[PDB]
Ligand SMILES: CC(=O)SCCNC(=O)CCNC(=O)[C@H](O)C(C)(C)COP(=O)(O)OP(=O)(O)OC[C@H]1O[C@@H](n2cnc3c(N)ncnc32)[C@H](O)[C@@H]1OP(=O)(O)O
Ligand SMILES: [Cl-]
């Protein structure tokens with residue numbers, strides 16, 4: 101009943117879209133957001149690009165099969181958390197927290213000033229969860245140009261501006 105966190109490798113990339121698809125099944129019982137469950141997921145090219153940079157981790161079960169991942173990208177002096185997904189059958193076992201812990205340890209080791217993300221404000225496993233870990237909700241102005249651009253494009257593909265926010269965890 102134990103899991104391990106490790107760096108992702110190139111051979112793992114092909115397995116990751118199915119994990120992101122499985123993770124999104126949690127949105128089918130939110131009526132306003134149920135469409136998310138059949139939204140796109142990142143392709144293998146995206147994962148391979150970040151695995152080459154080294155900023156990509158996964159959780160594996162006792163048989164070594166990947167069951168969740170965290171894909172991140174260094175952007176200037178910040179580590180941006182692009183996607184964090186745990187497969188449905190392995191949610192609520194602590195793995196999301198453990199992958200975030202790994203990402204922040206890597207951000208500190210690589211001399212990043214802060215971590216960033218964008219997410220839903222009022223989904224219980226999104227912004228409220230991240231806030232308990234120290235991520236701060238940003239105003240539009242505090243978001244800065246890079247995160248503002250993401251939020252703007254999100255509004256073109258289905259997200260409602262009033263339901264999304266950028267967040268930052270500053271490493272003191
Ligand atoms: C920047 C981004 O990537 S935002 C996108 C996030 N990804 C998604 O929303 C996809 C669907 N969700 C998931 O994949 C997972 O639920 C994750 C990654 C959000 C969380 O990973 P998990 O392994 O389930 O999280 P973990 O078991 O560590 O739980 C962490 C906290 O989330 C809470 N939580 C997790 N799932 C739920 C749920 N369905 N309902 C309410 N609370 C939940 C837990 O209660 C826990 O809080 P606690 O410390 O008060 O107990
Ligand atoms: Cl809803």
Ligand code: NA
Pocket residue numbers: 137138
């Ligand atoms: Na689908």
Ligand code: NA
Pocket residue numbers: 120140141142183
């Ligand atoms: Na995604």
Ligand code: NA
Pocket residue numbers: 177210211212213
């Ligand atoms: Na730095």
